[PDB]
Design a protein around this ligand. Structure first.
Ligand SMILES: [Mg+2]
Ligand SMILES: [Mg+2]
Ligand SMILES: [Mg+2]
Ligand SMILES: [Mg+2]
Ligand SMILES: [Mg+2]
Ligand SMILES: [Mg+2]
Ligand SMILES: [Mg+2]
Ligand SMILES: [Mg+2]
Ligand SMILES: [Mg+2]
Ligand SMILES: [Mg+2]
Ligand SMILES: [Mg+2]
Ligand SMILES: [Mg+2]
Ligand SMILES: [Mg+2]
Ligand SMILES: [Mg+2]
Ligand SMILES: [Mg+2]
Ligand SMILES: [Mg+2]
Ligand SMILES: [Mg+2]
Ligand SMILES: [Mg+2]
Ligand SMILES: [Mg+2]
Lengths: 155, 188, 53, 260
RNA sequence: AGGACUUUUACUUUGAAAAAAUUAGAGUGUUCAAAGCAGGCGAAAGCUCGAAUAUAUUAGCAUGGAAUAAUGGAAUAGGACG
RNA sequence: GAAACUGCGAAUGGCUCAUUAAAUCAGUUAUCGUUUAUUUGAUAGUUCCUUUACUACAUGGAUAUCUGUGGUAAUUCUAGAGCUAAUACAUGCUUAAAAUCUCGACCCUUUGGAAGAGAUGUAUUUAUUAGAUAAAAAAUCAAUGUCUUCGGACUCCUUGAUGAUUCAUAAUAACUUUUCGAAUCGCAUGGCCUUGUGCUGGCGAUGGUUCAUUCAAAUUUCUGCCCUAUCAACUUUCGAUGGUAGGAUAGUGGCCUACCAUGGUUUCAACGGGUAACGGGGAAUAAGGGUUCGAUUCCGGAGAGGGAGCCUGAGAAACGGCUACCA
């Protein structure tokens, strides 16, 4: 779901105010800026050496992670550059002393540095309002597959 | 009267929210500046908490910066050639942020001449020794020399004339220019 | 109208400005000397650490 | 409400001003000043209620106007000045000096304290920043912005303002095993020693405090104010020294110390 | 106090929090009480103890426990260590 | 000491519950996503621009109040004339030194190194740089810097905060229909004698840029709402979900626009309908579990006949403020 071209749209895609000097003869790939979101969260090497842009990247973009940290399960990875996470919980009805299974759908913005798919449990972090509904940035794909790490059977 | 609150929008689910708390003053939105070229005419607007804002409609000259050697000069904007949002602004010569314009480019030219003196487009001993110590490091790339011979520089504006009132930006240079000229050749 | 009290006020403003500038520069110099002293102390400590190790 | 609010109804006043719920519809709203109004103490409350030197509003106004009150070496002629925690109130008449420290019930108790130490004040460091032209500065809890501080003074620390010049006299570094005061919540007025300060990556530092009676509790770091070294407080602690005797122990104190 | 890996929960103990008024409840002869946060004691010559506590059963934060209840490891070894 | 100009509040308070069912609100977070009069603490020499000719012992014009002439049937209706002031409106002066950048009347054969000239406060806007940091030694090539006791040694490099930043801050180039940098008041009027109105000089009051603090204001995370399926699919051409760029915003944000993607919610009850529903702290009731109520003494929200629109300010979509339509 990611275009091969590093910039695909009409506007140019650059990290604002990080400049690579063309007159210089170092001729490294580019000058890519990055940061660590803290909380003992490892920045992915796919973001470290990657070539995407993703204005709203917790690791490379301007957005900062602060506030709530929510763990959930991916219910929809199939809309562009964003994720829909199913968070399940038990509401405690006290008149019966009984619990009640309930679910909420939290939109978030997964960076291209992560490879997500339906069913992955994801640790996500609070940030600024990114869109009308997304307020969280995907920070870790804990379960990449879960039960699909081993697929084939060849003794 | 143009509100920017979220109440008039439908909910994430899609329900039509009922009207509530008729829109306030801390939620207002003002008219677009849709600036033009020529006969500088900046109108002050008194916004929230004082803080004079400046609408910069009809702006002709502004500061522009060169990143390679890092030098800024006041120069004239001469039309807009590309806009990443809407080509309608390009046809109407509406100047907003991130628009791509042409530059008279003379001030950069004789700054280069008094700085390196390579005679693009085709003394005291102190200046001669400065140039000798420079030792022709001014190996600036070929396309900028091409439009120097043409005489009009390709620049991308970076200031917001709608808010700041200025007309500041930077010249396209390096792969930047590359990208956009492809787009321009798409237009051509 | 020109009044000796007005000239007194003008002189007081000028003298207060000059005195405040002098005091600010003196404080800046003292803070710089304090920074130099602290830097010398920790540089001596670093040299001792390098020698011992 | 469209704009700021300038009225404080009596029931909405903090329960540490602890006024009478009758005999008045409103309560003195503290004007803007060095302290949060929820945490501060208006001068009218301190004089009319705590000291009873006055009788009502007009008397407090007359007291403040003739410049007998001196808050931290300054006159402060406004009725609802937020004289907050650790501020010094000087009355040249009766030559008396007060320092506002919470009694362990958690209230701004009347603390008559000596003239010699009244020259200075203590303060908690809430910020250490670099202002324009590269000048370091420190913001205390009073909002005092002290310029050119000691280079190794950090946040959450404590410092000793001379209160005359308003500069840096001495400071105490926040770390384990240090005498400390509590300035909010259930542990108001409590005084102890810092046993441990659990970091809690991501926010809301907590510190464990053990007092002289060997009781232990835990409090937020925003809520904490280092006051000195164990056995050597830098100020004169109020009567009781904030041990928080149990209600049964308080009853035993009432029974034992009793003469009529 | 620093890199390092952290199976994840549900549950439960403790604490910080849940504004005051209200409910509970301590002290107190408003003449008793509803109440109120007062008052008491000197020789009458200024000296004083107060304005206590608990609960809120959900959501969030920290913390100790590991029975009960659920999920995950190593089966193509692409497993663990040196 | 009337009146009036100026300044400030009039956006607090008081009343009502009509609208509103993830709406308000409660508990709990966030603003490294923003504005903030006031209060409190600090905060600026440069306004000179070629300085060998300027008001700084004080720059200009109006203008209310008032004196007189009216108009209308009347309204906190005011037109004409004549003076007059400011912390109102406009201008504008000093005033140091230092250091850093840039440009050179020359020489003397390199290690080239130097007479000298202009700018640099802050404010705004844009580019770029610094804003470090896990730990012992090398060779080499180039570039070429100090000292050389002419072997060569380079030994010394300064760096704040958070969990995190493009943060705080600093620096270069520039930019501005060029913001501020006291032409303001009260009391006491001391000291030096350069004994003159000379030189200085205290305590305050108002202002005033920026940064904090406080009163806040806006948004904002998780969870929690009454009845109803005789409401099962709802939303998107007119923004519905997301992407990007721009505009607007004080600021994030489909908040709006342009072009794309076709998405988002739902049997864990979405959407629709009803509420003689403002939410809550709480009230009645009481073995325990609960049921009903909460328009109203406190906290929030909304409203001023229903609707929209807006000036002034720090703060209003104000209504004991205006504009228009409807009644
Ligand atoms: Mg009100
Ligand atoms: Mg309560
Ligand atoms: Mg009772
Ligand atoms: Mg409904
Ligand atoms: Mg940088
Ligand atoms: Mg910055
Ligand atoms: Mg945008
Ligand atoms: Mg109703
Ligand atoms: Mg109610
Ligand atoms: Mg109700
Ligand atoms: Mg009703
Ligand atoms: Mg109310
Ligand atoms: Mg209203
Ligand atoms: Mg009516
Ligand atoms: Mg105002
Ligand atoms: Mg209205
Ligand atoms: Mg009315
Ligand atoms: Mg009103
Ligand atoms: Mg009116």
């Amino acid at each position: 779901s990611t275009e091969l071209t590093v910039q695909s749209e009409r506007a140019f895609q650059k990290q604002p105010h990080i400049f690579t000097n063309p007159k210089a003869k170092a001729n490294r790939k580019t000058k890519r800026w990055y940061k660590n979101v803290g909380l003992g969260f490892k920045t992915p090497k796919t973001a470290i050496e990657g070539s995407y842009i993703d204005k709203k990247c917790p690791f490379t973009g301007l957005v900062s992670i602060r506030g709530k940290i929510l763990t959930g399960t991916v219910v929809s990875t199939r809309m562009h550059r964003t994720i829909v996470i199913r968070r399940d919980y038990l509401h405690y009805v006290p008149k019966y002393n009984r619990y009640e299974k309930r679910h909420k759908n939290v939109p978030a913005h997964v960076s291209p540095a992560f490879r997500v798919q339906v069913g992955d449990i994801v640790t996500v972090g609070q940030c600024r309002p990114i869109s009308k509904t997304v307020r969280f940035n995907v920070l870790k794909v804990a379960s990449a597959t879960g039960k699909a790490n081993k697929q084939f059977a060849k003794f | 009267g143009i509100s920017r609150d979220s109440r008039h929008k439908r909910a994430a689910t899609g329900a039509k929210r009922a009207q509530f708390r008729k829109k306030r003053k801390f939620e207002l939105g003002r008219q677009a500046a849709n600036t033009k070229i020529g006969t500088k005419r900046i109108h002050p607007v008194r916004t929230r908490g004082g803080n004079q804002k400046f609408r910069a409609l009809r702006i002709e000259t502004g500061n522009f910066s060169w990143a390679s050697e890092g030098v800024a000069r006041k120069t004239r904007i001469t039309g807009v050639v590309y806009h990443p949002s809407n080509n309608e602004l390009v046809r109407t010569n509406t100047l907003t942020k991130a628009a791509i314009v042409q530059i008279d480019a003379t001030p950069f030219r004789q700054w280069y001449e008094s700085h390196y003196g390579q005679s693009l487009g085709k003394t005291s001993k102190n200046t001669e020794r400065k140039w000798a110590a420079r030792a022709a490091e001014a190996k600036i790339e070929h396309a900028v020399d091409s439009q120097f011979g043409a005489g009009r520089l390709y620049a991308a504006i970076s200031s917001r004339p709608g808010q700041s009132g200025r007309c500041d930006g930077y010249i396209l240079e390096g792969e930047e220019l590359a990208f956009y000229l492809r787009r321009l050749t798409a237009k051509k | 109208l020109v009044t000796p009290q007005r000239l007194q006020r003008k002189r007081q403003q000028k003298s207060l400005k000059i005195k405040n500038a002098q005091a600010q520069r003196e404080a800046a110099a003292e803070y710089a000397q304090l920074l130099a002293k602290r830097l010398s102390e920790r540089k001596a400590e670093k040299a001792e650490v390098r020698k011992r190790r | 409400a469209r704009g700021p609010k300038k009225h404080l109804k009596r029931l909405a006043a903090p329960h540490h001003w602890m006024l009478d719920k009758l005999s008045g519809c409103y309560a003195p709203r503290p004007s803007a000043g060095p302290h949060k109004l929820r945490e501060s103490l208006p001068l009218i409350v301190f004089l009319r209620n705590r000291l009873k030197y006055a009788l009502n509003g007009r008397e407090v106004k007359a007291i403040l106007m003739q410049r007998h009150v001196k808050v931290d070496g300054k006159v402060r002629t406004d009725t609802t000045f937020p004289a907050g925690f650790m501020d010094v109130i000087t009355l040249e008449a009766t030559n008396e000096n007060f320092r506002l420290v919470y009694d362990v019930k958690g209230r701004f108790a009347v603390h008559r304290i000596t003239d010699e130490e009244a020259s200075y004040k203590l303060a908690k460091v809430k910020k250490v920043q670099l202002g324009k032209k590269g000048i370091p500065y420190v913001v205390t809890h009073d909002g005092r912005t002290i310029r050119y501080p000691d280079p190794n003074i950090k946040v959450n620390d404590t410092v000793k303002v001379d209160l005359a010049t308003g500069t840096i006299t001495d400071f105490i570094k926040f770390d384990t095993g240090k005498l400390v005061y509590v300035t909010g919540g259930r542990n108001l007025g409590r005084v102890g020693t810092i046993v441990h300060r659990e970091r809690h990556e991501g926010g809301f530092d907590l510190v464990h405090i053990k007092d002289s009676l060997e009781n232990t509790f835990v409090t937020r770091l925003n809520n904490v104010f280092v006051i000195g070294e164990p056995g050597r407080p830098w100020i004169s602690l109020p009567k009781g020294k904030g041990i928080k005797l149990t209600i049964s122990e308080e009853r035993d104190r009432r029974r034992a110390q009793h003469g009529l």
